[PDB]
Write a protein that holds these residues in place. Structure first.
Motif, short mmCIF file in Angstrom:
data_model
loop_
_atom_site.label_atom_id
_atom_site.label_comp_id
_atom_site.label_asym_id
_atom_site.label_seq_id
_atom_site.Cartn_x
_atom_site.Cartn_y
_atom_site.Cartn_z
N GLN A 267 0.91 -1.27 0.06
CA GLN A 267 0.07 -0.19 -0.11
C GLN A 267 0.88 1.43 0.18
O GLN A 267 1.98 1.20 0.48
N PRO A 268 0.50 2.38 -0.33
CA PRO A 268 1.02 3.63 -0.51
C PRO A 268 1.74 4.20 0.59
O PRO A 268 2.86 4.64 0.57
N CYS A 269 1.21 3.79 1.99
CA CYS A 269 2.04 4.19 3.02
C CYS A 269 2.58 3.08 3.78
O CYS A 269 3.35 3.15 4.73
N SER A 270 2.70 1.86 3.24
CA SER A 270 3.65 0.63 3.82
C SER A 270 5.12 1.30 3.82
O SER A 270 5.49 1.55 3.09
N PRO A 271 5.86 0.51 4.87
CA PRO A 271 7.22 0.92 5.01
C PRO A 271 7.87 0.56 3.64
O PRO A 271 8.82 1.29 3.08
N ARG A 272 7.56 -0.50 3.05
CA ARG A 272 8.22 -1.30 2.26
C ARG A 272 7.88 -0.32 0.73
O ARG A 272 8.92 0.02 -0.12
N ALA A 273 6.74 0.32 0.55
CA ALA A 273 6.47 1.20 -0.64
C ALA A 273 7.06 2.78 -0.19
O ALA A 273 7.38 3.24 -1.34
N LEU A 274 7.32 3.06 0.71
CA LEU A 274 7.88 4.46 1.01
C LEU A 274 9.50 4.36 0.90
O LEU A 274 9.87 5.21 0.17
N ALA A 275 10.13 3.13 1.23
CA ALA A 275 11.42 3.11 1.13
C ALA A 275 11.47 3.03 -0.12
O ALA A 275 12.62 3.56 -0.83
N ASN A 276 10.72 2.05 -1.09
CA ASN A 276 10.85 2.06 -2.45
C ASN A 276 10.73 3.52 -2.93
O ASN A 276 11.37 3.72 -4.18
N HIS A 277 9.87 4.25 -2.81
CA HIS A 277 9.65 5.49 -3.28
C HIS A 277 10.80 6.48 -3.12
O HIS A 277 11.21 7.11 -4.63
N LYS A 278 11.65 6.49 -2.18
CA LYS A 278 12.95 7.25 -2.25
C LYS A 278 13.79 6.59 -3.14
O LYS A 278 14.58 7.25 -3.83
N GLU A 279 14.19 5.23 -3.11
CA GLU A 279 15.13 4.52 -3.87
C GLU A 279 14.88 4.76 -5.44
O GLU A 279 15.77 5.04 -6.20
N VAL A 280 13.58 4.59 -5.82
CA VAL A 280 13.34 4.96 -7.23
C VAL A 280 13.50 6.66 -7.70
O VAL A 280 14.13 6.75 -8.47
N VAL A 281 12.96 7.24 -6.80
CA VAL A 281 12.81 8.87 -7.18
C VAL A 281 14.29 9.08 -7.17
O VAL A 281 14.66 9.96 -8.21
N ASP A 282 15.14 8.68 -6.41
CA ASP A 282 16.67 9.01 -6.18
C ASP A 282 17.40 8.53 -7.46
O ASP A 282 18.49 9.29 -7.54
N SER A 283 17.17 7.62 -8.01
CA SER A 283 17.64 7.08 -9.18
C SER A 283 17.37 8.01 -10.32
O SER A 283 18.50 7.87 -11.35
N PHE A 284 16.83 8.92 -10.33
CA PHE A 284 16.97 10.11 -11.50
C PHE A 284 17.53 11.45 -10.99
O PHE A 284 17.46 12.40 -11.94
N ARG A 285 18.02 11.55 -9.80
CA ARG A 285 18.54 12.97 -9.42
C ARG A 285 19.64 13.08 -10.07
O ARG A 285 19.99 14.33 -10.58
N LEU A 331 -0.89 10.10 2.73
CA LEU A 331 -1.49 11.19 3.75
C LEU A 331 -2.58 10.91 3.79
O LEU A 331 -3.12 11.19 5.09
N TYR A 332 -3.48 10.40 2.87
CA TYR A 332 -5.04 10.34 3.27
C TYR A 332 -5.10 9.11 4.07
O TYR A 332 -5.79 9.04 5.24
N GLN A 333 -4.32 7.83 4.05
CA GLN A 333 -4.18 6.78 4.94
C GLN A 333 -3.82 7.12 6.41
O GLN A 333 -4.28 6.68 7.45
#
Ligand SMILES: *[C@@H]1O[C@H](CO)[C@@H](O[C@@H]2O[C@H](CO)[C@@H](O[C@@H]3O[C@H](CO[C@H]4O[C@H](CO[C@H]5O[C@H](CO)[C@@H](O)[C@H](O)[C@@H]5O)[C@@H](O)[C@H](O[C@H]5O[C@H](CO)[C@@H](O)[C@H](O)[C@@H]5O)[C@@H]4O)[C@@H](O)[C@H](O[C@H]4O[C@H](CO)[C@@H](O)[C@H](O)[C@@H]4O[C@H]4O[C@H](CO)[C@@H](O)[C@H](O)[C@@H]4O[C@H]4O[C@H](CO)[C@@H](O)[C@H](O)[C@@H]4O)[C@@H]3O)[C@H](O)[C@H]2NC(C)=O)[C@H](O)[C@H]1NC(C)=O
Ligand SMILES: *[C@@H]1O[C@H](CO)[C@@H](O[C@@H]2O[C@H](CO)[C@@H](O[C@@H]3O[C@H](CO)[C@@H](O)[C@H](O[C@H]4O[C@H](CO)[C@@H](O)[C@H](O)[C@@H]4O[C@H]4O[C@H](CO)[C@@H](O)[C@H](O)[C@@H]4O)[C@@H]3O)[C@H](O)[C@H]2NC(C)=O)[C@H](O)[C@H]1NC(C)=O
Ligand SMILES: C[C@H]1O[C@H](O[C@H]2[C@H](O)[C@@H](O)[C@@H](O[C@H]3[C@H](O)[C@@H](O)[C@@H](O)O[C@@H]3CO)O[C@@H]2CO)[C@H](O)[C@@H](O)[C@@H]1N[C@H]1C=C(CO)[C@@H](O)[C@H](O)[C@H]1O
Ligand SMILES: *[C@H]1O[C@H](CO)[C@@H](O)[C@H](O)[C@@H]1O
Ligand SMILES: *[C@H]1O[C@H](CO)[C@@H](O)[C@H](O)[C@@H]1O
Ligand SMILES: *[C@H]1O[C@H](CO)[C@@H](O)[C@H](O)[C@@H]1O
Ligand SMILES: *[C@H]1O[C@H](CO)[C@@H](O)[C@H](O)[C@@H]1O
Ligand SMILES: *[C@H]1O[C@H](CO)[C@@H](O)[C@H](O)[C@@H]1O
Ligand SMILES: *[C@H]1O[C@H](CO)[C@@H](O)[C@H](O)[C@@H]1O
Ligand SMILES: *[C@H]1O[C@H](CO)[C@@H](O)[C@H](O)[C@@H]1O
Ligand SMILES: *[C@H]1O[C@H](CO)[C@@H](O)[C@H](O)[C@@H]1O
Ligand SMILES: *[C@H]1O[C@H](CO)[C@@H](O)[C@H](O)[C@@H]1O
Ligand SMILES: *[C@H]1O[C@H](CO)[C@@H](O)[C@H](O)[C@@H]1O
Length: 471
Positions: A267-285, A331-333
């Motif tokens: 789910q969007p707020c799961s620790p796994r999905a949040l950790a993944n979010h930073k890893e993915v976004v950071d790969s484009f920096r 945020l919603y969750q």
């Protein structure tokens, strides 16, 4: 702010542009049959003048949610789409016939004939996405007393797609980007969702889906293998890093507003999905000149995967919007739960935005909660501003925007780009989609089995639509 007003106006542009791309009255796609969603009106360089099962399903699910929220004028468009799919399902194509694999075919010609050239086929996410789009309308039909339409038109079409999912989920195929022949996260995630809501819908119309029932837990069991310990692997059988917006899309499209921050369903707020979010976004920096000088607490232009070379590898509007949408969902969750938790897994995601982050549970009335959600909302809006900055002056959204100068490139007026804008805007405004039953489908079996179950196939003929009045 100007973002708020830009969004309000852009949401109107997005709705109009989507309709312009749907036959047979769509202004930009003369030639497309009734209810056929065209990917882009671009007929050359690139030629996106075709109808993809994936784009169509994603766009129609967006329209169904708007319709159910009061946009009653979309009714005829939805009916035409469903009618067109009854035909498309039976079209013999390079992937097979209705009961022999044809449902996994990626795209068709706008006139409903098969596309016979080479293409990355099959793409097993399509039947799942189409089932999900139809189930939402079938639910409305049931709720508003048009039982016949739900039972005789929608259910039989859905039954075909769910049978395909249950029968072939455990087989390799191409990913959503149509390039990797293997097993993909997005695909597995949307297939699990489809079987779960498919079983609920089957029961609702007085039927059953035994194959949905036996296979859903096994797909979920397999889904756990994609977690590497630090991020979500986009595909097995791939030589890339595996960081790919494919995983953010998997999360936002299987988001259930009633779900907690469940790791098993990502789910969007799961620790796994949040950790993944930073890893993915950071790969484009560091790979896009457009991102030069931005710090880690700032939003950046997001592409598909860092190894991408399609049109040289550039950020995509829909990918940048997905990065924001996952955060609006989170945020919603958090708000609905009345708390936010920081664990060892998600610490880095939070620490980048709020340096005082520490593991623990933070109630919605706490000072830490307030600081974190403000930082998260700002970060999310940041992605949307980047989109606003590179959209055309009249609101047009293409497929990609240049990695160096941000100019629009590839397919112009991409229908999926517009649907992605509508969903991100909705979530930003706390407008969530109907639940799919995640709360009773997040339990992982003790042992995963490579398996399948064969359902049933039968050709559907849509004789006529009852005079449905939607008010
Ligand atoms: C916001 O404003 C923008 C700007 O006005 C709006 O976008 C414009 O929208 C119009 C349509 O209203 C588009 O017109 C079509 O143009 C294509 C040709 O496009 C190429 O060439 C354009 C011109 O290039 C030259 O001039 C420019 C300066 O003006 C110059 O910079 C350039 O160097 C060059 O000198 C390019 O601008 C255009 O670029 C865009 O697209 C690229 C590819 O997607 C993208 O990468 C770029 O970044 C850029 O976005 C591109 O290179 C015409 O072919 C097309 O004509 C078809 O459609 C009309 C009716 O719409 C019809 O009369 C024609 O006969 C023809 O019909 C065929 O195609 C239809 C579908 O497109 C189909 O329905 C028909 O049945 C028919 O199809 C049959 O034949 C084809 C043959 O290929 C076959 O494949 C089919 O199977 C079938 O048999 C239009 O005239 C503009 O291109 C577009 N401009 C831009 C910049 O995007 C935007 O919509 C507005 N947004 C909102 C929300 O309002
Ligand atoms: C059909 O269903 C069955 C049952 O669910 C599936 O079987 C499971 O398949 C997964 C994936 O192969 C497998 O998990 C691997 O277990 C190995 C140990 O037993 C691991 O070595 C392997 O590591 C990869 O994945 C990790 C994340 O889980 C990554 O951190 C790690 O870097 C590895 O990833 C790299 O290497 C793989 C090669 O495996 C490569 O493809 C990637 O691109 C990447 O480069 C996995 O953890 C389970 O053990 C299997 N379960 C059982 C019970 O057998 C089967 O895969 C399904 N098949 C299809 C086509 O759907
Ligand atoms: C539209 C689609 O175009 C591109 O995909 C095609 C490639 O251009 C072809 O080269 C070929 O790709 C093969 C590779 O060359 C090969 O090395 C291996 O990877 O196998 C590939 C498949 O055989 O065929 C591709 C089609 O399968 C581009 O790469 C791809 O990402 C593009 N897909 C986008 C378009 C739409 C429509 O809006 C969306 O549905 C997709 O999600 C987008 O990613
Ligand atoms: C997901 O669903 C499972 C049941 O399948 C629950 O146990 C879990 O708490 C979550 O709601
Ligand atoms: C939760 O539920 C699943 C089935 O949905 C079981 O397989 C699991 O063991 C747990 O009881
Ligand atoms: C896949 O395997 C399961 C058991 O592991 C069976 O129930 C199914 O029929 C298929 O053979
Ligand atoms: C799906 O595949 C399984 C094997 O894993 C078969 O047993 C089943 O009949 C269906 O074809
Ligand atoms: C899966 O297998 C069953 C049994 O062979 C068929 O009835 C179904 O059509 C699909 O082929
Ligand atoms: C699978 O089951 C369906 C629904 O019962 C049949 O209509 C079909 O012919 C196949 O036997
Ligand atoms: C299989 O089921 C479809 C949908 O009810 C029918 O149209 C077909 O004749 C066969 O019974
Ligand atoms: C179901 O499939 C048949 C062909 O098997 C079509 O003729 C019909 O229109 C529907 O697509
Ligand atoms: C819908 O029903 C017609 C007959 O009325 C079939 O020809 C078609 O294949 C589909 O089953
Ligand atoms: C609409 O109704 C006709 C009645 O003959 C059927 O043949 C067709 O399958 C569709 O359900």
């Amino acid at each position: 702010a100007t973002l708020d007003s830009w969004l309000s106006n852009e949401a109107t542009v997005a709705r109009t542009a989507i309709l312009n791309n749907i036959g047979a009255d769509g202004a930009w796609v003369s030639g497309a049959d009734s209810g056929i969603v065209v990917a882009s009106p671009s007929t050359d360089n690139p030629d996106y003048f075709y109808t993809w099962t994936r784009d169509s399903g994603l766009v129609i699910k967006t329209l169904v949610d708007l319709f159910r929220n009061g946009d009653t004028d979309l009714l005829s468009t939805i009916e035409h789409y469903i009618s067109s799919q009854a035909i498309i399902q039976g079209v013999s194509n390079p992937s097979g016939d209705l009961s022999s694999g044809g449902l996994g075919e990626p795209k068709f010609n706008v006139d409903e004939t098969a596309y016979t050239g080479s293409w990355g086929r099959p793409q097993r996410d399509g039947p799942a996405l189409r089932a999900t789009a139809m189930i939402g309308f079938g639910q409305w039909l049931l709720d508003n007393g048009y039982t016949s339409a739900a039972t005789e038109i929608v259910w039989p079409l859905v039954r075909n797609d769910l049978s395909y999912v249950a029968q072939y989920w455990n087989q390799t195929g191409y990913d959503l980007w149509e390039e990797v022949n293997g097993s993909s996260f997005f695909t597995i995630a949307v297939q699990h969702r489809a079987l779960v809501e498919g079983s609920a819908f089957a029961t609702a119309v007085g039927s059953s889906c035994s194959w949905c029932d036996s296979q859903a837990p096994q797909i979920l069991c397999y889904l756990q293998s994609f977690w590497t310990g630090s991020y979500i692997l986009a595909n097995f059988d791939s030589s890339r890093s595996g960081k790919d917006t494919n995983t953010l899309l998997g999360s936002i499209h299987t988001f259930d507003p009633e779900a907690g921050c469940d790791d098993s369903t990502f789910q969007p707020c799961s620790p796994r999905a949040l950790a993944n979010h930073k890893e993915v976004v950071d790969s484009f920096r560091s790979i896009y000149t457009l991102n030069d000088g931005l710090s880690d607490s700032e939003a950046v232009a997001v592409g598909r995967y860092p190894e991408d070379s399609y049109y040289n590898g550039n950020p995509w509007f829909l990918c940048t919007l997905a990065a924001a949408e996952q955060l609006y969902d989170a945020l919603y969750q958090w708000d609905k739960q009345g708390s936010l938790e920081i664990t060892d897994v998600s610490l880095d995601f939070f620490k980048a935005l709020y340096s005082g982050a520490a593991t623990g549970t933070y109630s919605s009335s706490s000072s830490t909660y307030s600081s974190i959600v403000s930082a998260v909302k700002t970060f999310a809006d940041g992605f949307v501003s980047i989109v606003e900055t590179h959209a055309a002056s009249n609101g047009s959204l293409s497929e990609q925007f240049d990695k160096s100068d941000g100019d629009e490139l590839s397919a112009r007026d991409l229908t999926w780009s517009y649907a992605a804008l509508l969903t991100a805007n909705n979530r930003r405004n706390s407008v969530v989609p109907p639940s799919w039953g995640e709360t009773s489908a997040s339990s992982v079996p003790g042992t995963c089995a490579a398996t399948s179950a064969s359902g049933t196939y039968s050709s559907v003929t849509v004789t006529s639509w009852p005079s449905i009045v939607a008010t």
